[model samples]
Target: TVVIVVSRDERILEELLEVVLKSDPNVKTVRTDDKEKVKEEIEKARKQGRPIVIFIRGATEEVVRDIVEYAQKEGLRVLVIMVDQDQEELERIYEQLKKDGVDVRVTDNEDEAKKRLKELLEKVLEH
Candidate 1:
């Protein structure tokens, strides 16, 4: 599938996955707490024909920036989901990463995130 979720907190993503899977075709959500694995997964997903959506959680600014750069290189769009409610920090990271031409979405609230996630999945899954 073209859609995936990238986050450090597996349980939260796992919990969200339950809701994500309730639809007709389940969206594949991948969780990786490791920095290297995160990079690898994005690149791997890029090889597929569908639009790759990655949801990133907690990572050092350096790691987050690196992932943003990596996402750009793979020509993949990335969605960064904030596990915490720190909007200022989340926007800052999103801004910093946006310069690299990577599509970043900081979803701190679960409700809005779900709507955005569903929209993204529908776009990719449509005929």
Candidate 2:
């Protein structure tokens, strides 16, 4: 299984990945700010018939749009972590992804985010 955890805060991103790795040694992670690189990885996942889980922290508008489209077209799943966003902003993202027919979840708590990611990892690997 492969998961991409994205965030503007580099520290938090690394921290999340570290936790993820500890949970499952076989699970791989992809982290990149470059849009092209991210796109390539997503495509790779689709081609490999592997599941890709995306965790977005303080998601940028364009990035969110890109992932939502990819999720619909490529079968990716997403979780938006709201460390800096207000409840309203997070809610809007949640609704938007739901409208797009993507499997998405949003969380503000750190532990809950980790739990959600772990749950997703388990689900994806089952297939």
Candidate 3:
């Protein structure tokens, strides 16, 4: 599986990388803040015929929605972990994404985020 991580939070990004790597040593990861780079990575993963997972943390709904839209267009998967976002807005985004069949999870706690991420990784690996 190929995981593309998008985040501006340096600390959480590193921690997420650790969690993802620990989940499976064979997993490939691409870390970036650029949306264009994300699209490129998605295409690259598609070419390799590997499953793609986009893991996003600490980004706004606009950004998350944009990425989700692109990934959906590309027929890939997404996992979102939002931190410190407004309650109403979080629920709005979560519900919309869920309805669209995206795996969107929210948590402010770092440990919980990591735990959910690990579980998501495991689920992805099964396919």
Candidate 4:
């Protein structure tokens, strides 16, 4: 399955498995390291019928608030993954997304990441 990724970290692209990882599927992660270019990335993923996984980092509150609000407004299914974030920031994001019914997640582990995202994507596609 195709897994579209938007992140500021290029190393994540290299870390993902190239073959089937249990239920995670052998995902080809099309990634964009440019955080500023995520709007375009989301649109591209949407047009291709691919699920998007966004990596949240840097300027935590400012960056994530906009992304989450926009995704909520657009009814976009996004799996947001961030590591070592401020507790307040993470809780705030979770609160908004939970209220908005946005599919947000936090896990940097490749296997778990793929599993959760795949599940979320399947649910999104089913709907």
Best by the lDDT measure: 3
C-alpha TM-scores of all predictions: 0.47, 0.50, 0.50, 0.41
What tens-digit string does per-residue lDDT give for candidate 4 at 8-36? Answer: 44454335323223345422233443446
TM-score of 1: 0.47
Candidate 4 has which clashing residue pairs, if any?
none
| Model 2: ten consecutive residues of lowest lDDT | 78-87
Tens-digit lDDT track for model 2 on 14-126? 77777777886544456665566667777776677666544456356787667667666654566555444245687888898999999887677889999999998988888
Error of 2 at 77 (Å): 3.2
* Steric clash pairs (candidate 1): 6-55
Ranking by lDDT: 3, 2, 1, 4
The reply for model 3, stretches above 4 Å from the true place, is 1-8, 53-60, 85-127
- Give per-residue CA lDDT, model 3, range 1-127, as digits (tens): 3344555557767787788778875455666656777678777777777665555552666765676787777666666554443466778888989989896777789999999999988988994
lDDT of candidate 1 over 20-122, digit per residue (tens): 6565332344455566886666556555544444455556677667767766676656565566545567778888899789877767679999999998999
Query: Model 4 Cα displacement at 124 (Å)?
Result: 60
Q: Against the true structure, candidate 2 has what lDDT?
A: 0.65
Q: In what order do the candidates fall by TM-score, top score first?
A: 2, 3, 1, 4
RMSD of each: 18.8, 18.4, 17.7, 18.8
